Design a protein around this ligand. Structure first.
Ligand SMILES: [Ca+2]
Ligand SMILES: [Ca+2]
Ligand SMILES: [Ca+2]
Ligand SMILES: [Ca+2]
Lengths: 16, 143, 17, 143
């Protein structure tokens, strides 16, 4: 779950 | 890329003014510094052993280039991992708390129970202080 | 491993508007 | 949710016109249909056995609400898993191939060798046809 969330955060940041 | 492959070449040649094609392995710290790395004592010890497995005391360019490509890629991912850390640690306390984790899971639409979120803290919290440090986060990410 | 990838796909999709 | 709970009460009450507070367990299939499920034969067999462990032939509303809550949760989970399957199966071949899995892993920045990707296919590939069906994916997503 740490990898999942970390990558979610980085995906979101990029899309913004 | 070729640009950075050239910076690496220029840094190497700093320590080979006689044009032998090798430099003393003892110069590794200063050569890495030239390239913008500040390796710790343990890292230097490890690399020198790794680079000079035959014990000659010298390194060639191909070997320098190999190690520097690896350190560059390691650096890029570390920086990206710490970008994510800062995205968890939005209160800038320098640790990822249970609160930070819960907030992130909610914002990202992952339905984790408090028990599952606590499990995640416990998994990462190697030092036992109840929160997650950059070192712990780096560990749990690089595995 | 299947789970991480599956959840990763769902997370990415959610994040797109 | 209160509106969903109301809908479940209304479906139960269709089969309790006499206001006894119970309906015949044999009405389960039609009650479930009213609520938008289409349970398979094996599913009905298993549920009836689970609902009526004392063998009375009857169920009360609390029993019915518990099972319908479970089934609704299970349906939501299934639909989400199937949404993920489609995200793997971007070529719409109805199966997750080694190609789809490799593409996903790469897209999600996950570094896996072909041997490691083949191992995932083999793990999920219960029927031995070399790719992953919806049923196989469902199975592996709930373990
Ligand atoms: Ca914090
Ligand atoms: Ca800690
Ligand atoms: Ca496919
Ligand atoms: Ca199969």
């Amino acid at each position: 779950n740490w990898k999942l969330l970390a990558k979610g955060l980085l995906i979101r940041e990029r899309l913004k | 890329t070729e640009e950075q492959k050239q910076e690496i070449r220029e840094a190497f040649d700093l320590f080979d003014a006689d044009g032998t094609g090798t430099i003393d392995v003892k110069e590794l710290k200063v050569a890495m510094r030239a390239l913008g790395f500040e390796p710790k004592k343990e890292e230097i010890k490890k690399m020198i052993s790794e680079i000079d497995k035959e014990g000659t005391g010298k390194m060639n360019f191909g070997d320098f280039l190999t190690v520097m490509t690896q350190k560059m890629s390691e650096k890029d991912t570390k920086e990206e991992i710490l970008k994510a850390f800062k995205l968890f640690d939005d209160d800038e306390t320098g640790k990822i708390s249970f609160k930070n984790l819960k907030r992130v899971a909610k914002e990202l639409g992952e339905n984790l129970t408090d028990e599952e979120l606590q499990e995640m803290i416990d998994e990462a919290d190697r030092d036992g202080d109840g929160e997650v440090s950059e070192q712990e986060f780096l560990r749990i990410m690089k595995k």
